[PDB]
C-alpha cells in the first residue's frame, strides 16, 4: 500500500501491476475508465523512459542540454545538429512535417486494437526476445516496468521544475551544483529567496 | 422585581443598553487612540 494505515479504495484490489491503492480523488471508479487510465499511464511512462536518457546523455557528451537542442528552431533559418554535425534537411517545416506524418499512422494502428491487454502489452513483433512467455516473470516485468516508469515520470517533473527554477541550463549542471556544496545550494534557496 | 427584570430583558431595552455601552466604548477608544488609519502595533 502507498500509505500505510490507510484503507484501500473499493475500485482497486491490488491485482493490477503496481496497484498500491492510491486514488485519493477516485478517478478510476468506472472499470473501463480505469482500463483507459492504465493504457494512458503506460504510454506516459514509456515516453518518459525514452525521455530520461535522451535528456541526460546529450548533456553528458557536451552537446548542450535538452533546452539548447530546441534553440535552433527559435532562430530564423536555424539548422539542427546531430553529434555536432548539421543535418542538411533539418529545418523546422520539414522536421514538423515528417513528425506529423510518421507520428501519425503509428499512433493510429495503436488505436485499431480493441483488446485491452493488447492495447497495454501488444506482444508479437514488439516482444522479440520472448520475455512474456513465462507468466510469473511476465507479471514481475510488468511491476518492474510500472515502477521504473513512475520513477521516470517523477524524473521528468524534476526536469521541468528544475528548468523553470534555473532557466537555460541542464539537469547535470544542477547535479554538479548540488555536489559542489550540498548544504548551501538546493531547493531551499528558491523555496525561500 | 422579576417582572421589571423581564422588562429589562426585552428587545429594545437590552438593545439600547448594549448599543449604548458599545458606543461609549468606541467613543472612549477614539478619544484615547484618535485618527487611526492603520494597525501599527505589529
Amino acid at each position: 500500500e502507498w500509505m500505510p494505515g490507510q484503507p484501500r479504495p473499493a475500485h482497486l484490489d491490488g491485482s493490477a501491476p503496481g496497484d498500491f491503492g492510491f486514488d485519493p480523488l477516485g478517478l478510476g471508479e468506472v472499470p473501463e475508465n480505469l482500463e483507459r487510465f492504465k493504457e494512458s499511464e503506460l504510454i506516459h511512462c514509456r515516453w518518459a523512459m525514452l525521455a530520461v536518457p535522451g535528456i541526460l546523455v546529450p548533456e553528458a557528451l557536451g552537446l548542450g542540454n535538452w533546452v539548447k537542442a530546441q534553440e535552433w528552431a527559435a532562430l530564423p533559418g536555424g539548422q539542427a545538429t546531430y553529434l555536432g554535425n548539421p543535418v542538411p534537411w533539418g529545418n523546422l517545416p520539414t522536421i514538423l512535417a515528417i513528425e506529423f506524418l510518421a507520428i501519425a499512422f503509428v499512433e493510429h494502428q495503436r488505436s485499431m486494437e480493441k483488446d485491452s491487454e493488447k492495447k497495454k502489452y501488444p506482444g508479437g513483433a514488439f516482444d522479440p526476445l520472448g520475455y512474456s512467455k513465462d507468466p510469473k516473470k511476465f507479471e514481475e516485468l510488468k511491476l518492474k516496468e510500472i515502477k521504473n516508469g513512475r520513477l521516470a515520470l517523477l524524473a521528468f517533473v524534476g526536469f521541468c521544475i528544475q528548468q523553470s527554477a534555473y532557466p537555460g541550463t541542464g539537469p547535470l549542471e544542477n547535479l554538479a551544483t548540488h555536489l559542489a556544496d550540498p548544504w548551501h545550494n538546493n531547493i531551499g534557496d528558491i523555496v525561500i529567496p | 422585581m422579576r417582572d421589571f427584570k423581564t422588562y429589562l430583558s426585552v428587545a429594545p431595552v437590552l438593545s439600547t443598553l448594549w448599543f449604548g455601552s458599545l458606543a461609549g466604548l468606541l467613543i472612549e477608544i477614539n478619544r484615547f487612540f484618535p485618527d487611526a488609519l492603520t494597525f501599527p502595533f505589529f
Partner: protein
Amino acid sequence: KKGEWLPGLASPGYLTGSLPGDNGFDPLALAEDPENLRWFVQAELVNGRWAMLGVAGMLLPEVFTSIGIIDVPKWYDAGKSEYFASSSTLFVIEFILFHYVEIRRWQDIKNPGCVNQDPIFKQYSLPPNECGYPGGIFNPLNFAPTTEAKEKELANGRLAMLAFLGFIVQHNVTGKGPFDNLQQHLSDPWHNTIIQTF
C-alpha cells in the same frame, strides 16, 4: 486526584475523569463532542511536549550564558547566527522529516495501532499501546507510564505553554531576554512589573 479549577463550579458531563489531568476546565464547551476531545487530548500532549523542549531551549542556554559557562546567543537572536548550512536547507530537511514522522503520528491518531510496524525491517514493531504514549523504542529506559506520570507530564506541559506565552509576550513588550526580565524583577520588584513596562 481529579480536583477542580473552580471549587464552586461543577464538572462537565464529558469530563468524568478517565483522562489524565482532568480538572473540569472546559468553560467554553470546546470538547463536548467525543471526537473533538480525542483530537484535543493529542493536540494538548504534542503542544505541551514541544513547549517543554522550547522553554528549556530559550531558558537554560540563556541562564548558562548569564552565568558565564557558555556564550550562546539569545533565542530571538539565534536565527541570524552562522551554521554549516543555511536556514533554508535546514527548513527543507526539517519539513521532509517532520512530514514523514507527523504523517505516521496522524495515522496512529486516526486509527490506533496501525503504524506500529517498521516499513523497512518488518521484524521490528512497537508493542500495543494507547494513543499518544507510544512505547517501545520511544521509551528506552522502560519507565512505567502510570497515570501519575501522565498527570505530571500534562501539568508540566501546561506550565511550559504558559511559560512560552509569557516568553513571546515579554519579548514583544520589552525586547530583552526572559531571564533578564527575571533579573530586573529581582532587582526591585515593586517598580519592575507589568505596569512600568507600559
